[PDB]
Amino acid sequence: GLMQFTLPVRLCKEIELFHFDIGPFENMWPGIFVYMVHRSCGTSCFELEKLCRFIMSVKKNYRRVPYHNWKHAVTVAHCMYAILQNNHTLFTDLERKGLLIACLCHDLDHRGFSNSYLQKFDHPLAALYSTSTMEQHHFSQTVSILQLEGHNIFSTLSSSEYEQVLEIIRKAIIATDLALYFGNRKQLEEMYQTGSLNLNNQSHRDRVIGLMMTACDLCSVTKLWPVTKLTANDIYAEFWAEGDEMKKLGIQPIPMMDRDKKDEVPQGQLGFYNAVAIPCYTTLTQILPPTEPLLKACRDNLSQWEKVIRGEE
Ligand SMILES: Cn1cc(-c2ccccc2)nc1CCc1ccc2ccccc2n1
Ligand SMILES: [Mg+2]
Ligand SMILES: [Zn+2]
């Protein structure tokens, strides 16, 4: 009850900032998550014994893949923490509880392959989940872990509150399918620009939570340049492996996944910032003004990729 998690002074201060990097000490990550849950939600939100046991089962069910790994799960949870903490009064008790767990669980048992590759391979999961294949799987794994003995962190919620929190987590995880982001943001764009956006409209909250999930998921682009640049290596390590597997199926991959076209990376990064990242943090900054530092950091990183193409680095 009176057992608080306390970080060293540099982490205690920097963790409140959007561009915080969780560091290379894997054994500190669970404690960092618990710290964030306690400040974001409260020390009474979860039983510490169950929470700690949930965290370690989630960790065990992330694989040793270059990018879509346990570090990614905690990083995305930390972007969510920073959004919630800078928007104190905009979110319910259930939403703060669910969204931190949603972020931690959002890539559970990821294999380092896209929905497209599961489809072309004809993987069993592609016949079970025709669309947002991996994202339905991540949610399926989340329910299964919550259903392990002494793992039900939501046990002190009522039946209605429990169903509500699992519906928040389900929508939040499905929303991390980037295929769904483009239409979600367009609708948010129209709703903001015609002034019809209403945060007491459940269907509108869902969309806004959705864009928050995309923003947290892409948050590598919002770090200081050295972190962004080194994370890109891990991102392309998965893509190129997938491109290798494409070539094994007798399918030339897209250039993004073809290691033979490494040189085009800087230009591919420009497109993704202009097509995906900047639009995402822009719409998010309009709806939630205090998330402006993500847009700013993302613009700074866009400029760094522009400097790479100009051979300045
Ligand atoms: C779209 N596109 C195409 C290329 C590309 C094309 C040809 C040759 C090399 C590359 N690269 C990308 C972006 C890759 C990418 C995808 C998701 C990300 C999420 C967070 C941070 C960085 C990310 N970067
Ligand atoms: Mg994912
Ligand atoms: Zn992710």
Instruction: List the CATH number of the domain containing 73.
Output: 1.10.1300.10
Position 174 in a domain: yes
> Does the beta carbon of 268 sit less than 6 angstroms from any atom of ligand 1?
yes
Domain count, the chain: 1
Q: Which domain holds residue 189?
A: 28-310
Residue 195 Cα, ligand 2 centroid: separation in angstroms? Answer: 31
Residue 264 Cα, ligand 1 centroid: separation in angstroms? Answer: 10
Position 11 in a domain: no
Position 8 in a domain: no
> Does the beta carbon of 259 sit less than 6 angstroms from any atom of ligand 1?
no
Position 32 in a domain: yes
Position 10 in a domain: no
| Contact indicator for 74, 105 with CB cutoff of 8 Å | no
Position 12 in a domain: no
> Does the beta carbon of 235 sit less than 6 angstroms from any atom of ligand 1?
yes
> Does the beta carbon of 264 sit less than 6 angstroms from any atom of ligand 1?
yes
| Contact indicator for 22, 32 with CB cutoff of 8 Å | yes
Catalytic residues: 68
Residue 203 Cα, ligand 2 centroid: separation in angstroms? Answer: 22
Integer Cα distance of 32 and 15 in angstroms: 9
Closest CA to 51 of 66, 40, 37: 37
- Which own/partner pairs from 85-89 qualify as long-range (CB within 8 Å, at least 24 positions apart)? 85/16, 85/39, 85/40, 86/288, 86/290, 86/291, 87/288, 87/290, 87/291
Position 301 in a domain: yes
Which residues contribute to the annotated binding site for 3',5'-cyclic AMP?
68, 269
Experiment type: X-ray
The residue to mutate among 272, 273, 294, 309, having the most atoms of ligand 1 within 8 angstroms of its beta carbon, is 272
| Contact indicator for 112, 68 with CB cutoff of 8 Å | yes
Resolution in Å equals 2.2
Which residues contribute to the annotated binding site?
68, 72, 106-107, 217, 269
Position 4 in a domain: no
The residue whose two tokens read 């799960």 is 73
> Does the beta carbon of 272 sit less than 6 angstroms from any atom of ligand 1?
yes
